[PDB]
Amino acid sequence: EKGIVEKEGYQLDTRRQAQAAYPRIKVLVIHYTADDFDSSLATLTDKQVSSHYLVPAVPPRYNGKPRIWQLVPEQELAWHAGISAWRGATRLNDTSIGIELENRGWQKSAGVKYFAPFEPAQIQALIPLAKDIIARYHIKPENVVAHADIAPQRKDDPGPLFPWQQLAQQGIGAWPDAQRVNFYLAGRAPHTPVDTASLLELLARYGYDVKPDMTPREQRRVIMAFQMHFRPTLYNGEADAETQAIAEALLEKYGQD
Amino acid sequence: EKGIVEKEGYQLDTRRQAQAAYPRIKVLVIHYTADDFDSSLATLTDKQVSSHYLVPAVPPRYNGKPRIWQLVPEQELAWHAGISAWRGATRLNDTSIGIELENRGWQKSAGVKYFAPFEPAQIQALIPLAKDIIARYHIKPENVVAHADIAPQRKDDPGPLFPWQQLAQQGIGAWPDAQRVNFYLAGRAPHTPVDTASLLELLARYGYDVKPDMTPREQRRVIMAFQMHFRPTLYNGEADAETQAIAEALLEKYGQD
Ligand SMILES: [Cl-]
Ligand SMILES: [Cl-]
Ligand SMILES: [Cl-]
Ligand SMILES: [Cl-]
Ligand SMILES: [Zn+2]
Ligand SMILES: [Zn+2]
């Protein structure tokens, strides 16, 4: 009958549905390819790495719409996150969708690591795709993340030129309330030094992989990753009052779950 | 055209498929309900807990087939594993399917914890369902597990009367090769005491949650959980030569991945 599924050696009665049923997909990870489109496509379809989506630097338009490549069905995991951790989860491939953005990433120029700006055409294509994914799985804003957020010791992508605040204004990803940032500054100048351990606690709670007995460099990488996402005007990895205030405002607004 | 999916604000080109694409579902967890069918169904459809499937103690037959209840679509997680760990993963709800077996579990009788046998009708219904799930997601034999295997400090289910060897003979779950068990015994009587730490290392590698500085009781719970699954004639949690030999033979056959 209705709600009865015939199988080989048994039948399934589907008439009673549990309330506790949730998506396995909880996180959306943003990457850059550090490579041109064709080479990125070749890599992302090889035996070692993949992503669910690949967005050209300037997507071609057909039928009045930008074209985006889908390489892996969303129901399956892609191999995009590697060793990773976010808000208490590990193995983020298992519970994420990975979007690759064609973009050069960083290139050293007189020794300075300089990042490549994202073209507006690419961001404008990304926006509806991201909104569709977020709506489909009820992804929380704090779970739209940089690869660097989940693997801070290893990765920088999508880096300090990625327009997170713009995307937040369009309903994609977390951003603190300006008045609350000012509140947590508590009269301090933005670059006033802060107890490093105090900041690392906040970042651990927001979701960054923080362990006991980290070296100074490891400590710097976590703070830098956070700054690249949320305080991109200065990502030297040094704990200051503004970086702390942003973490405090994020935690107040989005919690730790 | 073919391989082009029209969306709102973009289109998807699905013509190039990545090779690195795998199921998000990797583990099949077996439970008992410790409750009658109707009460189990009520619980498993409430706000706090659920499973993908619920198998009656003696399934009713319609169309010459046993009926099994499905409560959660496999694409979604159910809330069946709780705090858990297996072969380096945590949060096993995310990457598992949970099957609940209607069965009383344990009941104390003159203080002795006695388990309830599984009726052959229930096991015979379980077999084709398990084979279908395993085939669908390419689940490895070592990843068909007891709830107790993934939460040894908290759970005993499905307990020492669950017929794992019988299921292994039907292609469901891991079981060591008898000749290899004898080989790793290395001339020792089965109950000869073994260095507890030596056994805990093997269990950690097989996939059990083993931490540094565990108390004697915590150590006993991990060994007991292992024995309930693989050496059910004696599950006192004491390290002996037979328990070690089984762990050694399992590791040789199935590895750690
Ligand atoms: Cl990457
Ligand atoms: Cl990676
Ligand atoms: Cl349970
Ligand atoms: Cl639980
Ligand atoms: Zn990346
Ligand atoms: Zn259980």
Side-chain angles (χ1 to χ4, degrees):
Chain A
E1 324 195 47
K2 187 212 192 286
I4 304 306
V5 178
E6 300 292 350
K7 293 291 187 173
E8 180 151 281
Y10 63 101
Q11 61 174 211
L12 295 170
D13 188 333
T14 60
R15 288 163 175 158
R16 296 292 317 277
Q17 306 168 74
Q19 298 175 72
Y22 302 97
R24 296 179 187 276
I25 294 158
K26 305 175 189 188
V27 173
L28 181 56
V29 184
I30 312 300
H31 303 266
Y32 54 57
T33 60
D35 210 352
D36 62 76
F37 182 87
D38 291 333
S39 187
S40 295
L41 180 62
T43 295
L44 287 164
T45 56
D46 78 12
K47 289 184 286 197
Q48 295 167 32
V49 63
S50 63
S51 61
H52 297 91
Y53 299 96
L54 172 63
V55 186
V58 175
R61 305 178 72 78
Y62 305 95
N63 249 333
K65 306 179 184 173
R67 181 173 284 181
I68 294 165
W69 272 251
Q70 183 179 3
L71 312 179
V72 176
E74 292 182 342
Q75 78 208 113
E76 289 182 298
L77 65 84
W79 276 355
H80 64 99
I83 296 178
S84 49
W86 187 245
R87 296 177 73 94
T90 59
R91 302 186 177 183
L92 270 291
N93 285 339
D94 292 353
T95 55
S96 67
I97 287 173
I99 295 173
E100 284 273 5
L101 307 177
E102 180 199 355
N103 176 276
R104 173 176 75 254
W106 62 258
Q107 169 169 149
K108 305 194 182 180
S109 171
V112 198
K113 213 171 260 187
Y114 282 95
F115 289 82
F118 293 81
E119 275 227 70
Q122 183 174 62
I123 302 301
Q124 290 306 124
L126 175 59
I127 286 163
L129 170 60
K131 292 180 96 147
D132 285 353
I133 295 162
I134 293 162
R136 182 175 303 120
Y137 305 107
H138 317 293
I139 296 173
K140 301 189 267 213
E142 66 270 20
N143 291 325
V144 184
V145 304
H147 198 181
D149 292 331
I150 72 183
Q153 304 303 325
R154 302 187 301 104
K155 297 295 182 169
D156 286 357
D157 56 314
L161 298 184
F162 186 75
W164 289 108
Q165 190 178 181
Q166 187 196 155
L167 267 74
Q169 288 165 357
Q170 300 272 260
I172 304 156
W175 200 258
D177 286 341
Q179 286 192 121
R180 300 308 287 174
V181 176
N182 291 152
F183 178 76
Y184 286 109
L185 265 181
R188 298 173 292 173
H191 299 321
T192 302
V194 146
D195 181 319
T196 303
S198 295
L199 179 59
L200 289 167
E201 167 180 337
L202 298 175
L203 301 188
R205 298 293 72 81
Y206 191 73
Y208 290 83
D209 191 10
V210 172
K211 297 153 194 286
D213 308 299
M214 296 164 79
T215 63
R217 198 206 80 96
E218 285 169 341
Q219 296 177 36
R220 283 195 300 275
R221 284 291 312 180
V222 171
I223 297 164
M224 183 183 307
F226 180 66
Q227 289 165 338
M228 288 187 174
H229 187 154
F230 298 103
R231 209 286 296 271
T233 56
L234 180 63
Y235 51 92
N236 60 356
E238 299 301 330
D240 65 8
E242 181 180 21
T243 304
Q244 186 186 46
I246 294 167
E248 291 182 284
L250 282 171
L251 284 159
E252 181 181 82
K253 185 167 178 189
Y254 302 101
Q256 300 171 54
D257 189 67
Chain B
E1 324 195 47
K2 187 212 192 286
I4 304 306
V5 178
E6 300 292 350
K7 293 291 187 173
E8 180 151 281
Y10 63 101
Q11 61 174 211
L12 295 170
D13 188 333
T14 60
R15 288 163 175 158
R16 296 292 317 277
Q17 306 168 74
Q19 298 175 72
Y22 302 97
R24 296 179 187 276
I25 294 158
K26 305 175 189 188
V27 173
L28 181 56
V29 184
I30 312 300
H31 303 266
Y32 54 57
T33 60
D35 210 352
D36 62 76
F37 182 87
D38 291 333
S39 187
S40 295
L41 180 62
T43 295
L44 287 164
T45 56
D46 78 12
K47 289 184 286 197
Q48 295 167 32
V49 63
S50 63
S51 61
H52 297 91
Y53 299 96
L54 172 63
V55 186
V58 175
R61 305 178 72 78
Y62 305 95
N63 249 333
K65 306 179 184 173
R67 181 173 284 181
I68 294 165
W69 272 251
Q70 183 179 3
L71 312 179
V72 176
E74 292 182 342
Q75 78 208 113
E76 289 182 298
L77 65 84
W79 276 355
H80 64 99
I83 296 178
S84 49
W86 187 245
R87 296 177 73 94
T90 59
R91 302 186 177 183
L92 270 291
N93 285 339
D94 292 353
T95 55
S96 67
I97 287 173
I99 295 173
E100 284 273 5
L101 307 177
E102 180 199 355
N103 176 276
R104 173 176 75 254
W106 62 258
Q107 169 169 149
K108 305 194 182 180
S109 171
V112 198
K113 213 171 260 187
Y114 282 95
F115 289 82
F118 293 81
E119 275 227 70
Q122 183 174 62
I123 302 301
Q124 290 306 124
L126 175 59
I127 286 163
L129 170 60
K131 292 180 96 147
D132 285 353
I133 295 162
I134 293 162
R136 182 175 303 120
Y137 305 107
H138 317 293
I139 296 173
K140 301 189 267 213
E142 66 270 20
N143 291 325
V144 184
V145 304
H147 198 181
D149 292 331
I150 72 183
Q153 304 303 325
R154 302 187 301 104
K155 297 295 182 169
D156 286 357
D157 56 314
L161 298 184
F162 186 75
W164 289 108
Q165 190 178 181
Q166 187 196 155
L167 267 74
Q169 288 165 357
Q170 300 272 260
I172 304 156
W175 200 258
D177 286 341
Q179 286 192 121
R180 300 308 287 174
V181 176
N182 291 152
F183 178 76
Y184 286 109
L185 265 181
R188 298 173 292 173
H191 299 321
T192 302
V194 146
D195 181 319
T196 303
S198 295
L199 179 59
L200 289 167
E201 167 180 337
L202 298 175
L203 301 188
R205 298 293 72 81
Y206 191 73
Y208 290 83
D209 191 10
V210 172
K211 297 153 194 286
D213 308 299
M214 296 164 79
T215 63
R217 198 206 80 96
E218 285 169 341
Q219 296 177 36
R220 283 195 300 275
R221 284 291 312 180
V222 171
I223 297 164
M224 183 183 307
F226 180 66
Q227 289 165 338
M228 288 187 174
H229 187 154
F230 298 103
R231 209 286 296 271
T233 56
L234 180 63
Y235 51 92
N236 60 356
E238 299 301 330
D240 65 8
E242 181 180 21
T243 304
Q244 186 186 46
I246 294 167
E248 291 182 284
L250 282 171
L251 284 159
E252 181 181 82
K253 185 167 178 189
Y254 302 101
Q256 300 171 54
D257 189 67

